[PDB]
Ligand binder design. Structure first.
Ligand SMILES: [Mg+2]
Ligand SMILES: [Mg+2]
Ligand SMILES: [Mg+2]
Ligand SMILES: [Mg+2]
Ligand SMILES: [Mg+2]
Ligand SMILES: [Mg+2]
Ligand SMILES: [Mg+2]
Ligand SMILES: [Mg+2]
Ligand SMILES: [Mg+2]
Ligand SMILES: [Mg+2]
Ligand SMILES: [Mg+2]
Ligand SMILES: [Mg+2]
Lengths: 88, 218, 129
RNA sequence: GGCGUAAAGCGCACGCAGGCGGUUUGUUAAGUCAGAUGUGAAAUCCCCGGGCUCAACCUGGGAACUGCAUCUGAUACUGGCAAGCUUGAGUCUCGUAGAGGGGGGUAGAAUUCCAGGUGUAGCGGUGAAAUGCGUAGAGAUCUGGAGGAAUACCGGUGGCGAAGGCGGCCCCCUGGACGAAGACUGACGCUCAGGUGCGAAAGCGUGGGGAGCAAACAGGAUUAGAUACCCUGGUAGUCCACGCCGUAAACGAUGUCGACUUGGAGGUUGUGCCCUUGAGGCGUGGCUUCCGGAGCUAACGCGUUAAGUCGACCGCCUGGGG
RNA sequence: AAAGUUACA
């Protein structure tokens, strides 16, 4: 579930400060890390419908943050989706 | 002015939330009645009681719980007034056009105890008539001398004497009731927040009230 | 979520009068202060206060002429789901003029009688009868 | 105007279009508002008059024509734009309780079957009986073994899950709630037609598996009849893998999301403080059960988890039958 | 254990 060491790495990378956890870059990147990580889990457990519901909450709530960040400043959104790798 | 300090009460751990302004909690799961907000309204009730006693309004005292069962007799029959010490008959005020008949029978039986039903008839009938007379007397007691409806009602428990309060509200009779923390202010016209299930307290209430009435007779 | 803070304001007043509270309190706002100003000068509610630095908090002292509550009926008219704008011709009268209607004109928030004298119209915020 | 029970809340959720949207400042004037102009045919309608002796009818002026367009200005509200602010929403740190889910193992009890050893004449069943099983030796009892399915006690208006639903123990994958104190983002929000997903049992398809139960079916009774209830059996099914179906009295017959409005008694699960003293006490949070106040209402009843007072969206109803 | 039915003003 995105172990504490893994989260610190992403927070420090996309965060504009060492303890900046909450900026939409970090939030989206944290969601992307877990969505990609959970992808392997569901290639084995197809009928884990309850865990997939939690995954869909992350998929949708990332789109809400991505759609939000583009509205505020389309430039910072473009460097995000390119560096993370998504939006296709 | 917070003299006796024997009227803090609380009746229980719980309460009736309408009693909120007059109480604070205590360590024993107990609701201390604010006497500082009891003495001002108590004088107000005494002030109006003095006013109606000047108009000769036939003040009625109501107490049925064993604490006030005998004390109400002591205060009402003390000066000039009436009382109900036993069970309050449902409707002895609103249905007074019928209860007045029972008083008339009680007087007739009271007369019969002096000229009629004592030896002019069998013991099998004299006993039952006498048994009925004391049954009628204990229930229709102090109100036997009341000429009709009263003008002010004094109550010891709002919750216990709820029927009498509702009857007085149905009529046009002000209700001077003392209320615990478990009672209901909704219905009485002069709240007197304090203990009511204790001899030390009800005697203080009755003694103060009766003294006010005796002044009012002047 | 909360989408009509003013309708929230009227509900606190309505429930506070129904609960016989000595004062109701809600998060403050420019519009709430403007309306509460109308209600205070009109007699329906007593003095009001705004406290706070970064979270303003508006308190209204509810008024009771007798055992009853002064504010008998207070109703929201122009809600976010339906905006009601009135010309100067058709400004509503509440309880045959005994009550008031709080209306937002281009010259501030006033009553129906005040806006009528000013010869303006605007949004019908609420009826206060 | 309604939707707990009268007709009416989709089974549940995610979610695009749409609808709505916290607070402060500025700015623009789009909605909105105040005038003005152009126009809104005449006649009809209305109001004040006039003429047929009155009336109908005819007719002079108005007022209307609730509209639209343009010009000027007002900025309180809504909208656009800019800059913010944290209350909503979310991210992180630490911990907590869980039948939440998927996968893989395994433990014991019991039923059945098979093979054996004692051993006898009944067993089984019913309201009574009978079919059935049993001297080819049953039932009973002990030993060994095989198989499948379900997890006694704990166990609880206990818990978890959006709903359906989830109950031995152990592992490895995973989801979601909650709390304390801290930072962080800064309206990122609510609802949701169409769409998408999940969705008891039964059922269907293809492979397995099959102890026990058991539709169908058979026999025995019961009955006037008995295609039933009862008895003895017994196949699909119930179990697994993977697809399909997509319905339930899928129900607290109560859509979701916020706010506000007396109380009492409990359960469950976090926590921060004193006298850590020792059982304890005072508070603060989240879910949950019962009773009840006002209020509500046709009444039953609901009642801080509203069916109270309100807002934002959505769904649905319009007499009974057909 | 068995126990079905019985047109309205
Ligand atoms: Mg209707
Ligand atoms: Mg029905
Ligand atoms: Mg439902
Ligand atoms: Mg949408
Ligand atoms: Mg739950
Ligand atoms: Mg099935
Ligand atoms: Mg099958
Ligand atoms: Mg059978
Ligand atoms: Mg259905
Ligand atoms: Mg169910
Ligand atoms: Mg339904
Ligand atoms: Mg209803």
């Amino acid at each position: 579930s995105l172990s504490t060491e893994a989260t610190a790495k992403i927070v420090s990378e996309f965060g504009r400060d060492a303890n900046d956890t909450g900026s939409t870059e970090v939030q989206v990147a944290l969601l992307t890390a877990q969505i990609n990580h959970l992808q392997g889990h569901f290639a084995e457990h197809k009928k884990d419908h309850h865990s997939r519901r939690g995954l869909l909450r992350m998929v949708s709530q990332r789109r809400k943050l991505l759609d939000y960040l583009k509205r505020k400043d389309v430039a910072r959104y473009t460097q995000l989706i390119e560096r993370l790798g998504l939006r296709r | 002015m917070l003299k006796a300090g024997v009227h803090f009460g609380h009746q229980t751990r719980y309460w009736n939330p309408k009693m909120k302004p007059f109480i604070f909690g205590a360590r024993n799961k107990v609701h201390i009645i604010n006497l500082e907000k009891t003495v001002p309204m108590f004088n107000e009730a005494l002030a109006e009681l003095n006013k109606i006693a000047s108009r000769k309004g036939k003040i009625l005292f109501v107490g049925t719980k064993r604490a006030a069962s005998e004390a109400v007799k002591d205060a009402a029959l003390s000066c000039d007034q009436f009382f109900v010490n036993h069970r309050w008959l449902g409707g002895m005020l609103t249905n007074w056009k019928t209860v007045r008949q029972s008083i008339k029978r009680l007087k007739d039986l009271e007369t019969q105890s002096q000229d009629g039903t004592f030896d002019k008839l069998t013991k099998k009938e004299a006993l039952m008539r006498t048994r009925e007379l004391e049954k009628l007397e204990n229930s229709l007691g102090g109100i036997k001398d009341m000429g009709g409806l009263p003008d002010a009602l004094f109550v010891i428990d709002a919750d216990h004497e709820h029927i009498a309060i509702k009857e007085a509200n149905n009529l046009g009779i002000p209700v001077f009731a003392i209320v615990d923390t478990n009672s209901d202010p909704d219905g009485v016209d002069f709240v007197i927040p304090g203990n009511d299930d204790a001899i030390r307290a009800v005697t203080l209430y009755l003694g103060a009230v009766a003294a006010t009435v005796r002044e009012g007779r002047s | 979520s909360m989408q009509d803070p003013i309708a929230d304001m009227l509900t606190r007043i309505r429930n506070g009068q129904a609960a016989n509270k000595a004062a109701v309190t809600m998060p403050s706002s420019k519009l709430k202060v403007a309306i509460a100003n109308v209600l205070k000068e009109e007699g329906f509610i007593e003095d009001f206060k705004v406290e706070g630095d970064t979270k303003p908090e508006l308190e209204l002292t509810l008024k009771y002429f007798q055992g009853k509550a002064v504010v008998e009926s207070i109703q929201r008219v122009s809600r976010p789901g339906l905006r009601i704008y009135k010309r100067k011709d058709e400004l509503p009268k509440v309880m045959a003029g005994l009550g008031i209607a709080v209306v937002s004109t281009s010259k501030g928030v006033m009553t129906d009688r005040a806006a009528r004298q000013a010869g303006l119209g605007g949004e019908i915020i609420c009826y206060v009868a």
